[PDB]
Amino acid sequence: MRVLVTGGSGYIGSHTCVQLLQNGHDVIILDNLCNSKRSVLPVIERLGGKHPTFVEGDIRNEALMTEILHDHAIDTVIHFAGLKAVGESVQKPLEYYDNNVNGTLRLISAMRAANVKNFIFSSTATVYGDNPKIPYVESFPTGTPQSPYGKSKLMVEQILTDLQKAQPDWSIALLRYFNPVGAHPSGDMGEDPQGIPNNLMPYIAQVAVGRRDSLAIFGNDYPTEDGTGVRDYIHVMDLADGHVVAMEKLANKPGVHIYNLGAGVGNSVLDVVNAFSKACGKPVNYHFAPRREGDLPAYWADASKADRELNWRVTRTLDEMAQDTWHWQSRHPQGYPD
Ligand SMILES: NC(=O)c1ccc[n+]([C@@H]2O[C@H](COP(=O)([O-])OP(=O)(O)OC[C@H]3O[C@@H](n4cnc5c(N)ncnc54)[C@H](O)[C@@H]3O)[C@@H](O)[C@H]2O)c1
Ligand SMILES: O=c1ccn([C@@H]2O[C@H](COP(=O)(O)OP(=O)(O)O[C@H]3O[C@H](CO)[C@@H](O)[C@H](O)[C@H]3O)[C@@H](O)[C@H]2O)c(=O)[nH]1
Ligand code: NA
Ligand code: NA
Structure with a gap:
């Protein structure tokens, strides 16, 4: 399939890209490298056993995203790109809502323009909030995260769910990660x-x-x-694998598919x-x-x-x-x- 992996050079996105390439998918990475380096691309290449295309850019760039999607005939998008330093999110809220909330919205907005309707979102276990019921189940309602980072994730999950509904042909997976190592x-x-x-x-x-x-x-x-x-610690390779299956199985399957990954x-x-x-x-x-x-x-x-x-x-x-x-x-x- 033709996949756009935003934040693809990042930590989790780099391993997913290796595994996507091992399964022979066409990968196009999109990263603004605010928290990653090009030096990874070659490694991704080697380990992946195939060449992924890289584009340096920003998810907030509606027009670029929309171009990339069209240009590369994208089938589905894996969205790992964003900011995730809890602590700093408390000092610099604004920048978290802008890159996570708005970045997401720009990305999906472009998807809508390019007729792209298969999506995988990088969510968190924090969405559950302070839930005394353990372990966490997808069917639990969501709580109120303590951080702006926590909040941007949840808000995005709401926006995506609300979009899915207005545009019911969309396939959106809400992958709630636990503790990836x-x-x-x-x-x-x-x-x-x-x-x-x-x-x-x-x-x-x-x-x-x-x-x-x-x-x-x-x-x-x-x-x-x-x-x-x-x-709940979860190996990044497991994570990656999961992302590969989600993408392969969920494509073109209408709905909001929530899954905990741990x-x-x-x-x-x-x-x-x-x-x-x-x-x-x-x-x-x-x-x-x-x-x-x-x-x-x-x-x-x-x-x-x-x-x-x-x-x-x-x-x-x-x-x-x-x-x-x-x-x-x-x-x-x-x-x-x-
Ligand atoms: N690692 C964790 O502990 C944690 C737990 C759950 C959620 N996640 C999420 O999964 C995703 C990936 O996390 P990770 O550990 O690999 O983070 P990471 O920093 O390694 O990945 C983020 C990547 O995106 C790039 N980037 C950031 N904002 C951008 C923007 N607006 N446009 C383009 N590129 C941008 C960064 O350069 C980096 O390559 C994030 O959304 C994070 O919220 C991970
Ligand atoms: O130096 C340290 C760091 C962590 N911890 C403890 O280790 C556990 C794991 O903490 P940490 O690795 O920072 O993970 P989280 O607090 O569990 O949050 C991470 O995983 C969350 C989902 O569980 C996401 O909300 C975030 O994106 C992500 O960074 C916690 O109980 C911490 O108190 C320590 O004692 N010392
Ligand atoms: Na750091
Ligand atoms: Na402060």
């Missing part, structure tokens, strides 16, 4: 955050690689087995630390710090729907997630080249 098994691709990592794993990897002193565990007084926060199991901070310590052959240094604003104690997915309906499920373990992350980090300590 890990890297390409080759160790040649991986998450490459610039500056201080806001996420557990990268942070961990950074301490491990020796760039950081200690991992700060935000809280130890939670209502969990070990007192640390619990999340391992459907919970792991605590210490758990992750332990997996990582084991993978890197040494004790990961950490200490306990206070609770992180906004943080929820524990949650994980109920990913039965994806299983039944798409026949999709996670095949990688927590161990590999740590191993592959260590491999990457250790093989490319400076990340992707300038």
Whole structure:
């Protein structure tokens, strides 16, 4: 199929692009590289075993999107592009609503112009809000996210649902990610955050690689087995695979298909630390710090729907997630080249 992968050079989009190419689809990446580098493209190429087309641009550019879609005879669009730093979203709301909400709206607006009607959105588990019912199920109503980032995602899910209804031939999937970690098994691709990592794993990897002193565990007084926060960690390769199936199965299937993407199991901070310590052959240094604003104690997915309906499920373990992350980090300590 002809797919447009926005944010395609980004972290999750780069691995999805490799897997799309392995399944022989025609890929066209669209990225403004505000959080990624060209240096990945070649890697995507190699690992993908085929050449994806890249266009540097912005999702907010209605006319460009509309051109790209027409020009490349796009069949479906995978939209990973946007801003996702929770914390900064609290300092700079405006920029989050503009790139996520408005960026999305520009993109879909163009889709509408080019007669494009198959779509896959990068959603979150945060949409569930502060839901005491765990694990989370798609049939639960949505709550009120603590952050502007959380909010932009949800708002986009509403806009997309409202569009789908007015234009019922559309095929829209709302892929709610949980906690994506890990890297390409080759160790040649991986998450490459610039500056201080806001996420557990990268942070961990950074301490491990020796760039950081200690991992700060935000809280130890939670209502969990070990007192640390619990999340459903999902290998990025699993994620990718899923995106490939969603796209292949959902195309031209009218409706709003909501699916949770996770391992459907919970792991605590210490758990992750332990997996990582084991993978890197040494004790990961950490200490306990206070609770992180906004943080929820524990949650994980109920990913039965994806299983039944798409026949999709996670095949990688927590161990590999740590191993592959260590491999990457250790093989490319400076990340992707300038
Ligand atoms: N990684 C996570 O922890 C998390 C959890 C759930 C949701 N997601 C979502 O999935 C998507 C991908 O996340 P990720 O980890 O790969 O993020 P990422 O930063 O690695 O991917 C974003 C990419 O999009 C590009 N970009 C940003 N805004 C742009 C714009 N307006 N126009 C064009 N390109 C733009 C960035 O350069 C980057 O390549 C995002 O929407 C994110 O909200 C990921
Ligand atoms: O240095 C750190 C970082 C994280 N944590 C804890 O680790 C868990 C994971 O936190 P983190 O990796 O930052 O993930 P999230 O808070 O779980 O949010 C990520 O995943 C969310 C969906 O679950 C999305 O809303 C966001 O896009 C995404 O960045 C949490 O309980 C944190 O308190 C620490 O103790 N120390
Ligand atoms: Na502020
Ligand atoms: Na960062």
